[PDB]
Amino acid sequence: SAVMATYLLHDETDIRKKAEGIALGLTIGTWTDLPALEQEQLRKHKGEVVAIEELGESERVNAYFGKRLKRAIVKIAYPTVNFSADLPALLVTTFGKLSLDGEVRLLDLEFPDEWKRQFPGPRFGIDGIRDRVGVHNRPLLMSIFKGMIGRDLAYLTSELKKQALGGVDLVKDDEILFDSELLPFEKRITEGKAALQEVYEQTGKRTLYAVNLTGKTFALKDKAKRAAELGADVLLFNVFAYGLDVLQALREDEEIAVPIMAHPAFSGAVTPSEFYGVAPSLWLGKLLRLAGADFVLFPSPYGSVALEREQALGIARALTDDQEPFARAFPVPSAGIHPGLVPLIIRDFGLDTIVNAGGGIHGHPDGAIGGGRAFRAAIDAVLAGRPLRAAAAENEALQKAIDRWGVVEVEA
Amino acid sequence: SAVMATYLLHDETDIRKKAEGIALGLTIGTWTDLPALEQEQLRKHKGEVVAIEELGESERVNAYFGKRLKRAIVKIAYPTVNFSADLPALLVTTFGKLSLDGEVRLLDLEFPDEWKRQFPGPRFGIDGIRDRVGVHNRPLLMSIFKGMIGRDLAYLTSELKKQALGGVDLVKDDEILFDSELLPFEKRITEGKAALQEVYEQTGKRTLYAVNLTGKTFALKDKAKRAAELGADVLLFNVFAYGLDVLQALREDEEIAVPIMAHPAFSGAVTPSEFYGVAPSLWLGKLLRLAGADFVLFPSPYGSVALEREQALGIARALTDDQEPFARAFPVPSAGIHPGLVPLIIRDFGLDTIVNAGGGIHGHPDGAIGGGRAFRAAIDAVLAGRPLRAAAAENEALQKAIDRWGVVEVEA
Ligand SMILES: [Mg+2]
Ligand SMILES: [Mg+2]
């Protein structure tokens, strides 16, 4: 039983020598000088280099570093008997001191099925969330509150209604919305709930509210329990600012048992480099799903700061792969989203995804209501097998969106 | 009252425009579309671009990216009334969504003194640690166990005594040493304490043991409290695998009140990039000191993976700057350390530093005892104003070390 870590290395010196050094150094430390009796005893703890895929030197990279760097993908097996069954131990064992060793980037971690079972996975996942909001088949639609910092509850309820009236399935707090006297955590939940039921009463639409769960680590479980008692729909959580283990703890607490939406804030401090850090498929995908996230918002492959398409798809695949002993986490491509992008979003990510209108929904000529109507009309068009403009001809909200932001061509 | 964040940005588009968009987008969202009542209401919550230092383009960077990237150091002010007084809120506000915005690297954070006072700083600091170990004036000396994974308590105590007999002031667990049936957390502490007291009786030397505090986040306080009851000397903590807030929580718990040694494990996933992440002076220095670390181990500016010298000095300055309302934290340059570097270490970092012999102390011809004597003799030589070779001619342990690793020139 061993966790196999896959790394990308750049180095002036022999890669194989470095790999062997890591396998031994990060496990038992010494081997050759140990008596036969000890070797047999410590055999089970010995790390091993599983594979080394030599890559071609990159002129671009060599020019950047001003030296000749050999490149290779290295796989190392770490016996699970070497560390405790928790994410902090996993990270320190596979990328602790090693993260300081020059150019090394963690690309993936493969866990033996038995080890994975010691972790929760999402409590609800895609299936559970779809039931909770009552929406099947079509992708979901969500938006974000705009300009709430410094505002009061009346403003919150008013803004929440507009978004719900626009037909969005879920509305979340801005990740930078923290608790205050004006907007207490518990009040956002209860006031928001009342407002959303009123909307159901009038339009027949069911909308959930993902409230930001913030503050100090050791106060999270108590407030989350309170949120659960108050009937909070979803808990938005800036996991990367707290640690993966905290997400897991929230997921495993039976007194909480509320869906958890993981926000990507701060993940960018770790994922972008070509030579260092941790790949997004692992940091935002595999690990967040295993830790308990029901929703995972990540950089979309569209817009001004689009994530490389294959990287974005890789995240979605890790979140939904049915080979994992966990429920699927909802992939939520975020940033650079507008109605004209719906056909591409569905083509790239499928129907089990969430169209995140973000705060941009408010930028529609007719406010959030018009913005939500445009998105819902666009989603229906794709499911009805029609081009957006065909639906736009019958839906003013959508036509206004198209004239404002256009339609992204999907024809290959 | 605002936290001023300093960033390094690379972008092919106008930097000031992007900076203004960040200051506004990450605070109140919109301004020019607000009525008078709302503007005066949200004025105090409005972020502002404090300054922009244009750096000019780099051909090396341009070649790497394959395009022209403008470069500038940007300072933005975020009103403290915008977020709760906790580190997770601080990180999310200043580098949450922003960490995903292309090429942005967080270099520093400056806070009003009143805001700083809401945080603990080290409980003991340099002065406190020197008292607890009983060593003043001279820099301290510490080492690490070698290959303890899979070993038993008989081996632990044996190796611990050898290091203490070498004259080291502190011995720490390997950061990858996790609790097991062979080496339970509480037993390492109690047996280690007994073994160390035997050494004092023999050589009159006092040696502390920094035990690894691991496991799940919500079990940390309980075991740390047990460690205190059992008389643990120092708690080694892989803070980056958890979160800054957890370190702060451990520091503020009056039922623990045991020195905390922060390990750099995983910090490398965040600090090395030229275009992304967080600068080490802030990530390993300023924030760890503010959060509560009494000792901070960080990449030394020596050896195969040496951290650029000014960066390393920057970390040490953040840890010891007397201008901060916190006790000074012990700077511990780590990696690439050998007796021949002692003169340079003292010249670079001063007397209030710790010479981290690491696991290399065991590589001395005469084991840890000889390795420790070599280091102690090296430190004494520098304080006595003598060349290492002069002292080596009178100290075998040191002579052996010098012949093996040599002496690094300290003359400017
Ligand atoms: Mg946001
Ligand atoms: Mg170590």
Short mmCIF file of C-alpha atoms in Angstrom, two decimals, chain B:
data_model
loop_
_atom_site.label_atom_id
_atom_site.label_comp_id
_atom_site.label_asym_id
_atom_site.label_seq_id
_atom_site.Cartn_x
_atom_site.Cartn_y
_atom_site.Cartn_z
CA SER B 1 -7.24 52.26 8.80
CA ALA B 2 -6.24 49.97 5.95
CA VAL B 3 -3.99 47.05 5.14
CA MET B 4 -1.65 48.05 2.33
CA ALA B 5 -0.66 45.18 0.07
CA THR B 6 2.33 45.40 -2.25
CA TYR B 7 2.27 43.29 -5.42
CA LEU B 8 4.48 42.61 -8.41
CA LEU B 9 2.48 42.53 -11.64
CA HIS B 10 3.35 41.44 -15.18
CA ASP B 11 0.79 42.23 -17.87
CA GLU B 12 0.64 43.14 -21.55
CA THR B 13 -2.17 45.59 -20.79
CA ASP B 14 -2.04 48.85 -18.81
CA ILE B 15 -1.04 48.06 -15.21
CA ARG B 16 -2.66 51.10 -13.59
CA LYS B 17 -5.99 50.23 -15.19
CA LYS B 18 -5.74 46.68 -13.85
CA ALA B 19 -4.68 47.95 -10.42
CA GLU B 20 -7.58 50.40 -10.19
CA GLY B 21 -9.93 47.59 -11.18
CA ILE B 22 -8.56 45.39 -8.39
CA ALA B 23 -8.80 48.09 -5.72
CA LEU B 24 -12.43 48.69 -6.72
CA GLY B 25 -13.49 45.16 -7.63
CA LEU B 26 -12.10 43.68 -4.43
CA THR B 27 -13.77 46.22 -2.17
CA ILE B 28 -17.05 47.98 -3.00
CA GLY B 29 -17.39 46.71 -6.58
CA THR B 30 -18.85 49.87 -8.13
CA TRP B 31 -18.59 53.59 -7.40
CA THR B 32 -19.56 55.94 -10.25
CA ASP B 33 -23.00 54.32 -10.50
CA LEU B 34 -23.79 55.06 -6.85
CA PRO B 35 -26.17 57.73 -5.49
CA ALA B 36 -24.85 60.32 -3.02
CA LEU B 37 -26.25 58.55 0.04
CA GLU B 38 -24.62 55.26 -0.93
CA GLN B 39 -21.29 56.87 -1.83
CA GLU B 40 -20.93 58.51 1.58
CA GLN B 41 -22.06 55.21 3.10
CA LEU B 42 -19.46 53.10 1.29
CA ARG B 43 -16.63 55.65 1.16
CA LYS B 44 -14.89 54.07 4.16
CA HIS B 45 -15.02 50.66 2.45
CA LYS B 46 -13.45 51.84 -0.82
CA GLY B 47 -10.04 50.44 -1.69
CA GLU B 48 -7.44 52.60 -3.41
CA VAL B 49 -4.31 52.26 -5.52
CA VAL B 50 -1.71 53.90 -3.26
CA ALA B 51 1.19 53.77 -5.70
CA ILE B 52 2.59 52.21 -8.84
CA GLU B 53 6.29 51.83 -9.52
CA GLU B 54 6.98 51.11 -13.18
CA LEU B 55 9.88 48.68 -13.62
CA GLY B 56 10.25 48.60 -17.39
CA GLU B 57 10.15 45.43 -19.49
CA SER B 58 12.47 42.44 -19.22
CA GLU B 59 13.63 40.83 -22.45
CA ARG B 60 14.21 37.59 -20.53
CA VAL B 61 10.62 37.59 -19.26
CA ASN B 62 9.25 38.70 -22.64
CA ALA B 63 11.08 35.86 -24.38
CA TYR B 64 9.75 33.33 -21.88
CA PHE B 65 6.12 34.42 -22.26
CA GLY B 66 6.49 35.07 -25.97
CA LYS B 67 5.09 38.59 -25.67
CA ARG B 68 5.74 42.02 -24.18
CA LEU B 69 4.89 42.14 -20.48
CA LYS B 70 4.83 45.46 -18.66
CA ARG B 71 6.10 45.23 -15.08
CA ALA B 72 5.27 47.25 -11.98
CA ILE B 73 5.13 47.14 -8.19
CA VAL B 74 1.59 48.02 -7.12
CA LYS B 75 0.39 49.10 -3.68
CA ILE B 76 -3.30 48.87 -2.84
CA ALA B 77 -5.07 49.89 0.37
CA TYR B 78 -7.91 47.71 1.70
CA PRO B 79 -9.96 49.25 4.55
CA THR B 80 -9.78 47.08 7.67
CA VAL B 81 -13.50 47.68 8.23
CA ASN B 82 -14.04 45.44 5.18
CA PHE B 83 -13.05 42.20 6.86
CA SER B 84 -12.92 40.34 10.17
CA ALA B 85 -9.73 40.41 12.24
CA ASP B 86 -8.40 36.99 11.30
CA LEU B 87 -5.72 35.71 8.94
CA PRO B 88 -8.03 33.76 6.61
CA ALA B 89 -10.02 36.95 5.95
CA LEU B 90 -6.78 38.86 5.40
CA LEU B 91 -5.49 36.37 2.82
CA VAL B 92 -8.81 36.12 1.00
CA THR B 93 -9.20 39.89 0.86
CA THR B 94 -5.68 40.65 -0.37
CA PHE B 95 -4.88 37.57 -2.44
CA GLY B 96 -7.97 35.41 -2.87
CA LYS B 97 -9.56 35.98 -6.26
CA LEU B 98 -6.53 38.14 -7.05
CA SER B 99 -4.24 35.10 -6.94
CA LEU B 100 -6.11 33.86 -10.03
CA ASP B 101 -5.69 37.08 -12.03
CA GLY B 102 -2.84 36.14 -14.35
CA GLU B 103 0.62 37.23 -13.22
CA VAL B 104 0.27 38.71 -9.73
CA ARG B 105 2.66 38.01 -6.85
CA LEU B 106 2.07 39.22 -3.28
CA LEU B 107 5.25 40.81 -1.93
CA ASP B 108 4.25 42.41 1.36
CA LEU B 109 1.46 43.51 3.69
CA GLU B 110 1.54 46.47 6.06
CA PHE B 111 -1.00 46.91 8.84
CA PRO B 112 -2.00 49.71 11.21
CA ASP B 113 -0.55 49.12 14.68
CA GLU B 114 -4.05 48.86 16.13
CA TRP B 115 -4.92 46.05 13.72
CA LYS B 116 -1.66 44.22 14.53
CA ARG B 117 -2.51 44.24 18.23
CA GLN B 118 -5.39 41.89 17.46
CA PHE B 119 -2.78 39.20 16.86
CA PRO B 120 -0.44 37.45 19.36
CA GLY B 121 3.07 37.35 17.97
CA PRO B 122 5.43 34.74 19.51
CA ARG B 123 4.68 33.73 23.10
CA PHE B 124 8.36 33.41 24.04
CA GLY B 125 10.44 34.68 21.16
CA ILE B 126 14.23 34.90 21.15
CA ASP B 127 14.51 36.13 24.74
CA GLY B 128 12.14 33.46 26.04
CA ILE B 129 13.79 30.63 24.13
CA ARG B 130 17.26 31.61 25.36
CA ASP B 131 15.98 31.50 28.94
CA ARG B 132 14.29 28.12 28.54
CA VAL B 133 17.42 26.57 27.02
CA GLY B 134 19.79 28.55 29.23
CA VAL B 135 22.04 29.85 26.46
CA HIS B 136 22.71 33.55 26.00
CA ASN B 137 25.00 35.54 23.72
CA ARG B 138 26.10 32.75 21.35
CA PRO B 139 23.90 31.49 18.52
CA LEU B 140 22.10 28.25 19.30
CA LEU B 141 22.77 24.88 17.68
CA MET B 142 20.11 22.36 16.65
CA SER B 143 20.02 19.01 14.84
CA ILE B 144 17.54 16.49 13.45
CA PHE B 145 17.03 12.76 14.00
CA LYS B 146 18.24 10.61 11.10
CA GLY B 147 16.03 7.84 9.71
CA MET B 148 13.53 7.43 12.54
CA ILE B 149 10.57 6.26 10.44
CA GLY B 150 9.86 2.67 11.44
CA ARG B 151 12.13 2.83 14.50
CA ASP B 152 11.26 2.32 18.17
CA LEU B 153 11.58 4.32 21.40
CA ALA B 154 14.82 2.60 22.39
CA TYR B 155 16.31 3.96 19.19
CA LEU B 156 14.74 7.37 19.71
CA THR B 157 16.19 7.87 23.20
CA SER B 158 19.57 6.50 22.08
CA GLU B 159 19.79 8.88 19.13
CA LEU B 160 18.49 11.76 21.23
CA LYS B 161 21.20 11.31 23.86
CA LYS B 162 23.93 11.09 21.20
CA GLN B 163 22.91 14.44 19.77
CA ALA B 164 22.69 16.04 23.21
CA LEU B 165 26.13 14.66 24.10
CA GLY B 166 27.37 16.44 20.99
CA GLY B 167 26.40 19.68 22.68
CA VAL B 168 23.40 20.68 20.56
CA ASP B 169 20.87 22.97 22.26
CA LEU B 170 17.86 21.47 20.52
CA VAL B 171 16.92 18.30 18.66
CA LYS B 172 13.77 18.11 16.55
CA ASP B 173 11.75 15.29 15.03
CA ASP B 174 11.99 14.96 11.25
CA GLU B 175 8.99 16.87 9.82
CA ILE B 176 7.84 13.63 8.18
CA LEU B 177 7.77 11.73 11.48
CA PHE B 178 4.13 10.92 12.23
CA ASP B 179 2.59 9.24 15.26
CA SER B 180 2.62 5.47 15.27
CA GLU B 181 2.30 2.53 17.64
CA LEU B 182 6.10 2.37 17.77
CA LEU B 183 6.49 6.09 18.45
CA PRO B 184 3.36 7.53 20.12
CA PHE B 185 3.30 11.33 20.52
CA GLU B 186 3.09 11.24 24.31
CA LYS B 187 5.81 8.59 24.64
CA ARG B 188 8.28 10.49 22.48
CA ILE B 189 7.83 13.42 24.85
CA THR B 190 8.05 11.56 28.16
CA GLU B 191 10.84 9.17 27.16
CA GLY B 192 12.73 11.92 25.38
CA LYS B 193 12.51 14.12 28.47
CA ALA B 194 13.90 11.38 30.70
CA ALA B 195 16.75 10.62 28.30
CA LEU B 196 17.66 14.30 28.02
CA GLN B 197 17.77 14.76 31.79
CA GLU B 198 20.29 11.90 31.95
CA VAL B 199 22.53 13.80 29.55
CA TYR B 200 22.42 16.93 31.70
CA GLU B 201 23.50 14.90 34.74
CA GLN B 202 26.45 13.64 32.72
CA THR B 203 27.84 16.57 30.74
CA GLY B 204 25.99 19.45 32.37
CA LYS B 205 24.46 20.34 29.00
CA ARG B 206 20.79 21.25 28.65
CA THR B 207 19.09 20.07 25.45
CA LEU B 208 15.50 20.67 24.34
CA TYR B 209 13.39 18.33 22.21
CA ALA B 210 11.01 19.76 19.60
CA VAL B 211 8.38 17.08 19.05
CA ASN B 212 6.32 16.95 15.86
CA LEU B 213 2.70 18.00 16.47
CA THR B 214 0.67 16.28 13.75
CA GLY B 215 -2.70 14.78 12.92
CA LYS B 216 -6.06 16.36 12.21
CA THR B 217 -6.66 20.04 12.95
CA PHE B 218 -9.39 19.53 15.53
CA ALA B 219 -7.27 17.14 17.58
CA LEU B 220 -4.25 19.48 17.76
CA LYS B 221 -5.28 21.54 20.80
CA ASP B 222 -5.99 18.48 22.92
CA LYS B 223 -2.68 16.78 22.21
CA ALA B 224 -0.77 20.08 22.50
CA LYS B 225 -2.37 20.54 25.92
CA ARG B 226 -1.28 17.01 26.83
CA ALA B 227 2.24 17.81 25.62
CA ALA B 228 2.32 20.78 27.99
CA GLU B 229 1.13 18.64 30.91
CA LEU B 230 3.86 16.13 30.04
CA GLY B 231 6.46 18.88 29.94
CA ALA B 232 7.27 18.99 26.22
CA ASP B 233 10.00 21.54 25.43
CA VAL B 234 8.93 22.65 21.97
CA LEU B 235 6.19 21.78 19.49
CA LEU B 236 7.36 21.38 15.87
CA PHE B 237 4.52 22.39 13.53
CA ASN B 238 4.08 21.98 9.75
CA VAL B 239 1.97 25.15 9.64
CA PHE B 240 1.76 25.44 5.85
CA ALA B 241 -0.06 22.10 5.65
CA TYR B 242 -2.73 23.49 7.94
CA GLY B 243 -3.26 27.24 7.90
CA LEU B 244 -1.84 30.36 9.56
CA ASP B 245 -4.96 30.59 11.74
CA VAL B 246 -4.23 27.20 13.30
CA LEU B 247 -0.76 28.38 14.35
CA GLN B 248 -2.37 31.45 15.90
CA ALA B 249 -4.92 29.29 17.75
CA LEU B 250 -2.17 27.12 19.23
CA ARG B 251 -0.24 30.23 20.29
CA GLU B 252 -3.26 31.82 21.99
CA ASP B 253 -4.30 28.71 23.96
CA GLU B 254 -3.21 29.35 27.55
CA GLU B 255 -3.52 25.62 28.24
CA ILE B 256 -0.69 24.95 25.81
CA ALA B 257 1.84 27.76 26.32
CA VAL B 258 4.75 25.75 24.91
CA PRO B 259 7.26 27.16 22.38
CA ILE B 260 6.29 26.60 18.74
CA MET B 261 8.76 25.87 15.94
CA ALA B 262 7.31 26.48 12.46
CA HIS B 263 8.59 24.18 9.70
CA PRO B 264 8.83 25.42 6.06
CA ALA B 265 7.37 22.19 4.64
CA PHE B 266 5.09 22.99 1.68
CA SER B 267 5.92 26.72 1.76
CA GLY B 268 7.78 26.05 -1.49
CA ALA B 269 4.52 25.48 -3.34
CA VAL B 270 3.91 29.20 -2.82
CA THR B 271 7.22 31.13 -2.69
CA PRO B 272 9.64 30.31 -5.59
CA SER B 273 7.92 31.77 -8.68
CA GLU B 274 9.03 35.06 -10.23
CA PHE B 275 5.47 35.85 -11.36
CA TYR B 276 3.11 34.20 -8.86
CA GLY B 277 2.67 33.30 -5.22
CA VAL B 278 3.74 35.09 -2.07
CA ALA B 279 7.24 36.37 -1.27
CA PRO B 280 9.10 34.43 1.45
CA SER B 281 9.78 37.51 3.62
CA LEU B 282 6.01 37.74 4.05
CA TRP B 283 4.96 34.06 3.89
CA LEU B 284 7.73 32.68 6.13
CA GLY B 285 8.68 35.82 8.01
CA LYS B 286 6.15 38.54 8.80
CA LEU B 287 3.05 36.31 8.92
CA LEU B 288 4.56 33.44 10.92
CA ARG B 289 5.94 35.84 13.54
CA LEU B 290 2.60 37.63 13.81
CA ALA B 291 0.74 34.30 14.01
CA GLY B 292 2.86 33.01 16.90
CA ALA B 293 5.99 31.13 15.79
CA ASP B 294 8.88 31.30 18.28
CA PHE B 295 11.23 29.69 15.74
CA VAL B 296 10.96 29.82 11.96
CA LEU B 297 13.06 27.45 9.85
CA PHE B 298 13.54 28.73 6.30
CA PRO B 299 15.65 28.01 3.19
CA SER B 300 19.21 29.11 3.88
CA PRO B 301 21.20 31.10 1.29
CA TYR B 302 23.82 28.32 1.18
CA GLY B 303 24.08 25.01 -0.66
CA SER B 304 22.53 23.32 -3.69
CA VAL B 305 19.12 24.96 -3.33
CA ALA B 306 20.20 28.20 -1.69
CA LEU B 307 17.60 30.95 -1.42
CA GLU B 308 18.78 34.24 -2.95
CA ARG B 309 20.76 35.98 -0.18
CA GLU B 310 18.68 39.17 0.08
CA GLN B 311 15.50 37.08 0.26
CA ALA B 312 16.92 35.06 3.16
CA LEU B 313 18.02 38.23 4.93
CA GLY B 314 14.57 39.68 4.31
CA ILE B 315 13.01 36.74 6.12
CA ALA B 316 15.33 37.17 9.10
CA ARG B 317 14.62 40.91 9.28
CA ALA B 318 10.86 40.35 9.32
CA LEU B 319 11.30 37.82 12.13
CA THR B 320 13.42 40.14 14.29
CA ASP B 321 12.53 43.74 13.42
CA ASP B 322 12.11 45.51 16.78
CA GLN B 323 9.64 47.94 15.18
CA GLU B 324 6.87 45.32 15.33
CA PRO B 325 4.55 44.95 18.38
CA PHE B 326 5.55 41.28 18.64
CA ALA B 327 8.39 39.43 20.33
CA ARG B 328 11.21 38.51 17.93
CA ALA B 329 11.09 35.02 16.39
CA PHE B 330 14.28 32.93 16.07
CA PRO B 331 15.53 32.86 12.45
CA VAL B 332 16.78 29.38 11.54
CA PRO B 333 18.50 29.23 8.12
CA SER B 334 18.12 25.60 7.05
CA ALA B 335 19.69 23.28 4.46
CA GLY B 336 23.23 23.24 3.08
CA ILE B 337 24.66 23.73 6.56
CA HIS B 338 28.05 22.44 7.75
CA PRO B 339 30.66 23.54 10.36
CA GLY B 340 32.64 25.40 7.71
CA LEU B 341 29.73 27.79 7.20
CA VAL B 342 29.38 28.92 10.83
CA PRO B 343 31.48 32.07 10.35
CA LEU B 344 29.37 33.10 7.36
CA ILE B 345 26.09 32.27 9.13
CA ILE B 346 27.02 34.45 12.09
CA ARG B 347 28.23 37.23 9.81
CA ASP B 348 25.03 37.11 7.73
CA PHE B 349 22.48 36.61 10.51
CA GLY B 350 24.16 37.73 13.73
CA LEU B 351 24.33 36.12 17.15
CA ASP B 352 20.57 35.75 17.49
CA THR B 353 20.19 32.90 15.03
CA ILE B 354 20.32 29.13 15.24
CA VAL B 355 22.84 27.02 13.37
CA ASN B 356 20.74 24.15 12.04
CA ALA B 357 23.07 21.18 11.60
CA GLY B 358 20.04 19.23 10.39
CA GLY B 359 20.43 15.51 9.84
CA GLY B 360 23.88 16.24 8.47
CA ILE B 361 25.27 16.21 12.00
CA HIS B 362 25.17 12.41 11.78
CA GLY B 363 27.49 12.45 8.76
CA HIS B 364 30.51 13.43 10.85
CA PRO B 365 33.27 10.76 11.03
CA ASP B 366 32.51 10.33 14.73
CA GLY B 367 28.73 10.41 14.55
CA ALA B 368 26.39 13.02 16.03
CA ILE B 369 28.58 13.53 19.10
CA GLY B 370 31.53 14.48 16.93
CA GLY B 371 29.34 16.45 14.56
CA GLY B 372 27.94 18.44 17.46
CA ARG B 373 31.38 19.10 18.92
CA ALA B 374 32.55 20.32 15.53
CA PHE B 375 29.70 22.84 15.38
CA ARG B 376 30.10 23.97 18.99
CA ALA B 377 33.84 24.44 18.46
CA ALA B 378 33.11 26.37 15.26
CA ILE B 379 30.72 28.71 17.06
CA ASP B 380 33.17 29.23 19.94
CA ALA B 381 35.94 30.04 17.45
CA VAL B 382 33.90 32.80 15.80
CA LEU B 383 32.96 34.36 19.12
CA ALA B 384 36.59 34.17 20.26
CA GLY B 385 37.65 36.01 17.13
CA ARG B 386 39.63 33.14 15.64
CA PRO B 387 39.82 31.53 12.18
CA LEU B 388 38.13 28.12 12.12
CA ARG B 389 41.43 26.60 11.06
CA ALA B 390 43.14 28.11 14.10
CA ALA B 391 40.58 26.49 16.40
CA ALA B 392 40.54 23.29 14.33
CA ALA B 393 44.26 22.86 14.98
CA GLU B 394 43.17 22.49 18.61
CA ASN B 395 39.92 20.57 18.14
CA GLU B 396 39.78 17.15 16.45
CA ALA B 397 36.03 17.06 15.83
CA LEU B 398 36.27 20.41 14.04
CA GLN B 399 39.42 19.45 12.13
CA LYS B 400 37.70 16.34 10.77
CA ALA B 401 34.68 18.39 9.69
CA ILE B 402 36.86 21.03 8.02
CA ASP B 403 38.92 18.48 6.07
CA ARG B 404 35.65 16.94 4.90
CA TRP B 405 33.52 19.97 3.99
CA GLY B 406 36.06 22.80 4.03
CA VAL B 407 35.71 26.43 5.12
CA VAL B 408 33.61 29.12 3.44
CA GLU B 409 35.28 32.51 3.08
CA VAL B 410 33.59 35.29 5.05
CA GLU B 411 35.81 38.17 3.93
CA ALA B 412 33.89 40.74 1.89
#
